Write an enzyme that holds these catalytic residues in place. Structure first.
Site, PDB file in Angstrom:
ATOM      1  N   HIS A  40     -32.804  36.036   0.120  1.00  0.00           N
ATOM      2  CA  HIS A  40     -33.061  35.885   1.546  1.00  0.00           C
ATOM      3  C   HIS A  40     -32.466  37.026   2.369  1.00  0.00           C
ATOM      4  O   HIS A  40     -32.764  37.130   3.558  1.00  0.00           O
ATOM      5  CB  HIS A  40     -32.670  34.492   2.051  1.00  0.00           C
ATOM      6  CG  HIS A  40     -31.236  34.309   2.394  1.00  0.00           C
ATOM      7  ND1 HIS A  40     -30.318  33.678   1.587  1.00  0.00           N
ATOM      8  CD2 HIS A  40     -30.591  34.599   3.541  1.00  0.00           C
ATOM      9  CE1 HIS A  40     -29.161  33.612   2.225  1.00  0.00           C
ATOM     10  NE2 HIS A  40     -29.303  34.148   3.423  1.00  0.00           N
ATOM     11  N   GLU A  52     -15.210  48.976   1.124  1.00  0.00           N
ATOM     12  CA  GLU A  52     -14.966  48.653   2.513  1.00  0.00           C
ATOM     13  C   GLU A  52     -13.855  47.630   2.684  1.00  0.00           C
ATOM     14  O   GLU A  52     -13.760  46.653   1.938  1.00  0.00           O
ATOM     15  CB  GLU A  52     -16.230  48.059   3.154  1.00  0.00           C
ATOM     16  CG  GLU A  52     -17.330  49.063   3.421  1.00  0.00           C
ATOM     17  CD  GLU A  52     -17.097  49.909   4.659  1.00  0.00           C
ATOM     18  OE1 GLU A  52     -15.934  49.978   5.087  1.00  0.00           O
ATOM     19  OE2 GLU A  52     -18.066  50.494   5.175  1.00  0.00           O
ATOM     20  N   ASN A  54     -12.335  47.401   6.715  1.00  0.00           N
ATOM     21  CA  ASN A  54     -12.863  47.353   8.071  1.00  0.00           C
ATOM     22  C   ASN A  54     -14.227  48.043   8.075  1.00  0.00           C
ATOM     23  O   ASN A  54     -14.319  49.253   7.826  1.00  0.00           O
ATOM     24  CB  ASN A  54     -11.900  48.034   9.039  1.00  0.00           C
ATOM     25  CG  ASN A  54     -12.285  47.793  10.471  1.00  0.00           C
ATOM     26  OD1 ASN A  54     -13.451  47.908  10.833  1.00  0.00           O
ATOM     27  ND2 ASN A  54     -11.309  47.447  11.304  1.00  0.00           N
ATOM     28  N   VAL A  57     -14.601  51.103  10.762  1.00  0.00           N
ATOM     29  CA  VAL A  57     -13.677  52.230  10.739  1.00  0.00           C
ATOM     30  C   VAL A  57     -13.760  52.877   9.365  1.00  0.00           C
ATOM     31  O   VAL A  57     -13.705  52.169   8.359  1.00  0.00           O
ATOM     32  CB  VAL A  57     -12.217  51.774  11.011  1.00  0.00           C
ATOM     33  CG1 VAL A  57     -11.257  52.962  10.912  1.00  0.00           C
ATOM     34  CG2 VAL A  57     -12.111  51.052  12.346  1.00  0.00           C
ATOM     35  N   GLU A  62     -14.326  54.368   1.069  1.00  0.00           N
ATOM     36  CA  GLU A  62     -15.727  53.996   1.060  1.00  0.00           C
ATOM     37  C   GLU A  62     -16.583  54.903   0.184  1.00  0.00           C
ATOM     38  O   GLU A  62     -16.330  56.104   0.050  1.00  0.00           O
ATOM     39  CB  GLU A  62     -16.310  54.060   2.466  1.00  0.00           C
ATOM     40  CG  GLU A  62     -15.647  53.123   3.462  1.00  0.00           C
ATOM     41  CD  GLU A  62     -14.491  53.708   4.246  1.00  0.00           C
ATOM     42  OE1 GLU A  62     -13.930  54.769   3.876  1.00  0.00           O
ATOM     43  OE2 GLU A  62     -14.121  53.058   5.251  1.00  0.00           O
ATOM     44  N   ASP A  84     -32.577  31.962  -5.170  1.00  0.00           N
ATOM     45  CA  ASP A  84     -32.141  32.876  -4.104  1.00  0.00           C
ATOM     46  C   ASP A  84     -31.230  33.951  -4.687  1.00  0.00           C
ATOM     47  O   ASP A  84     -30.005  33.923  -4.567  1.00  0.00           O
ATOM     48  CB  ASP A  84     -31.464  32.100  -2.986  1.00  0.00           C
ATOM     49  CG  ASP A  84     -31.211  32.936  -1.733  1.00  0.00           C
ATOM     50  OD1 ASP A  84     -31.790  34.035  -1.621  1.00  0.00           O
ATOM     51  OD2 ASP A  84     -30.450  32.442  -0.854  1.00  0.00           O
ATOM     52  N   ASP A 171     -15.438  27.071   4.912  1.00  0.00           N
ATOM     53  CA  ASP A 171     -16.776  27.298   4.359  1.00  0.00           C
ATOM     54  C   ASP A 171     -17.131  28.769   4.521  1.00  0.00           C
ATOM     55  O   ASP A 171     -16.481  29.502   5.268  1.00  0.00           O
ATOM     56  CB  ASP A 171     -17.781  26.433   5.145  1.00  0.00           C
ATOM     57  CG  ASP A 171     -19.150  26.234   4.523  1.00  0.00           C
ATOM     58  OD1 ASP A 171     -19.415  26.653   3.376  1.00  0.00           O
ATOM     59  OD2 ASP A 171     -19.977  25.596   5.244  1.00  0.00           O
ATOM     60  N   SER A 172     -18.175  29.202   3.835  1.00  0.00           N
ATOM     61  CA  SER A 172     -18.848  30.447   4.190  1.00  0.00           C
ATOM     62  C   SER A 172     -19.777  30.193   5.390  1.00  0.00           C
ATOM     63  O   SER A 172     -20.020  29.051   5.787  1.00  0.00           O
ATOM     64  CB  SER A 172     -19.540  31.036   2.954  1.00  0.00           C
ATOM     65  OG  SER A 172     -20.445  30.122   2.402  1.00  0.00           O
ATOM     66  N   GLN A 174     -22.677  32.411   8.525  1.00  0.00           N
ATOM     67  CA  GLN A 174     -23.669  33.466   8.747  1.00  0.00           C
ATOM     68  C   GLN A 174     -23.031  34.829   8.582  1.00  0.00           C
ATOM     69  O   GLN A 174     -21.961  35.097   9.113  1.00  0.00           O
ATOM     70  CB  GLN A 174     -24.249  33.340  10.165  1.00  0.00           C
ATOM     71  CG  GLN A 174     -24.951  32.054  10.461  1.00  0.00           C
ATOM     72  CD  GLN A 174     -24.071  31.107  11.257  1.00  0.00           C
ATOM     73  OE1 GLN A 174     -23.309  31.524  12.139  1.00  0.00           O
ATOM     74  NE2 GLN A 174     -24.186  29.832  10.967  1.00  0.00           N
ATOM     75  N   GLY A 175     -23.715  35.703   7.860  1.00  0.00           N
ATOM     76  CA  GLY A 175     -23.216  37.023   7.562  1.00  0.00           C
ATOM     77  C   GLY A 175     -22.470  37.132   6.246  1.00  0.00           C
ATOM     78  O   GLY A 175     -22.218  38.251   5.778  1.00  0.00           O
ATOM     79  N   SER A 177     -23.866  35.606   3.582  1.00  0.00           N
ATOM     80  CA  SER A 177     -24.948  35.466   2.634  1.00  0.00           C
ATOM     81  C   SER A 177     -25.034  36.643   1.695  1.00  0.00           C
ATOM     82  O   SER A 177     -24.865  37.796   2.089  1.00  0.00           O
ATOM     83  CB  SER A 177     -26.278  35.367   3.371  1.00  0.00           C
ATOM     84  OG  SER A 177     -26.394  34.108   3.975  1.00  0.00           O
ATOM     85  N   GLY A 178     -25.326  36.337   0.431  1.00  0.00           N
ATOM     86  CA  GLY A 178     -25.450  37.338  -0.601  1.00  0.00           C
ATOM     87  C   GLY A 178     -24.158  37.673  -1.297  1.00  0.00           C
ATOM     88  O   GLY A 178     -24.192  38.313  -2.354  1.00  0.00           O
TER      89      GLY A 178
HETATM   90  N1  LIG Z   1     -22.579  26.854   5.451  1.00  0.00           N
HETATM   91  C1  LIG Z   1     -22.816  27.848   4.618  1.00  0.00           C
HETATM   92  N2  LIG Z   1     -22.066  27.934   3.536  1.00  0.00           N
HETATM   93  N3  LIG Z   1     -23.798  28.726   4.845  1.00  0.00           N
HETATM   94  C2  LIG Z   1     -24.797  28.586   5.920  1.00  0.00           C
HETATM   95  C3  LIG Z   1     -24.883  29.863   6.699  1.00  0.00           C
HETATM   96  C4  LIG Z   1     -25.239  31.021   5.802  1.00  0.00           C
HETATM   97  C5  LIG Z   1     -24.275  31.116   4.637  1.00  0.00           C
HETATM   98  C6  LIG Z   1     -24.165  29.807   3.914  1.00  0.00           C
HETATM   99 CA   LIG Z   2     -14.612  51.157   6.506  1.00  0.00          CA
END
Ligand SMILES: N=C(N)N1CCCCC1
Ligand SMILES: [Ca+2]
Length: 223
Positions: A40, A52, A54, A57, A62, A84, A171-172, A174-175, A177-178
């Protein structure tokens, strides 16, 4: 990452940032020329950023290498997020050192109750938005399949697992992902989906990497 801690610079040496003018997803370095991420996260025009901490910066460790090809899993379903997973080949090999290193693929699937490390540059709030710039880390257990299916009726396939805390708060997000889920020194998961972030009874859902090792190995051998 919601409810995590600052990892420390280059303490997660396999973590990569995918950049298309800006950070948009994580990934994991699995050898000197290949990255694994979430399907995704696919888009054209990816630069992989290694070493990486920061992301705003230049700190000196890097390596910035553009992708030469991307391969989304043949059976990825963007509606259900089944399968996925995506492979990205680098145009040239990275230079591996203590701060930029590959993560091993698993030879067995991890069991519920195993503690893992999840990392990323994603949102740190469950309500609202704050993106952190330095890499964040979270230790979390794999949940039983029964708990996972009870949290997300009708949505969990054999290619997914849940990890985190049913009470919420960690939790994880947005951002992230992957990015990687590493357990006992092996890549077991990819940050995939969930309902909101860090909500009660809604743990994160992760791609189950151990189901894909044969596809990964075959694909790398031939591309
Ligand atoms: N809540 C989690 N773990 N998420 C939902 C938002 C994207 C990453 C995975
Ligand atoms: Ca950097």
């Amino acid at each position: 990452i919601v409810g995590g801690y600052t990892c420390g610079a280059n303490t997660v040496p396999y973590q990569v940032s995918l950049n298309s003018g800006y950070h948009f997803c994580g990934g994991s370095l699995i050898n000197s020329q290949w990255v694994v991420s979430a399907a995704h996260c696919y888009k054209s025009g990816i630069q992989v950023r290694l070493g990486e901490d920061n992301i705003n910066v230049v700190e000196g460790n890097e390596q910035f290498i553009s992708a030469s090809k991307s391969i989304v899993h043949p059976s990825y379903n963007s509606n259900t997020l089944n399968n996925d997973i995506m492979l990205i080949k680098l145009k040239s090999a990275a230079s591996l050192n203590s701060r930029v290193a590959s993560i091993s693929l698993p030879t067995s699937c991890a069991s519920a109750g195993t503690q893992c490390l999840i990392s990323g540059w994603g949102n740190t709030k469950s309500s609202g938005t704050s993106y952190p710039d330095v890499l964040k880390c979270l230790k979390a257990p794999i949940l039983s399949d029964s708990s996972c299916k009870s949290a997300y009726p009708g949505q969990i396939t054999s290619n997914m697992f849940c990890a985190g805390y049913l009470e919420g708060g960690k939790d994880s997000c947005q951002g992230d992902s992957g990015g990687p889920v590493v357990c006992s020194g092996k890549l077991q998961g990819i940050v995939s989906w969930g309902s909101g972030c860090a909500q009660k009874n809604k743990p994160g859902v992760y791609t189950k990497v151990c189901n894909y090792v044969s596809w990964i190995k075959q694909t790398i051998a031939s591309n």
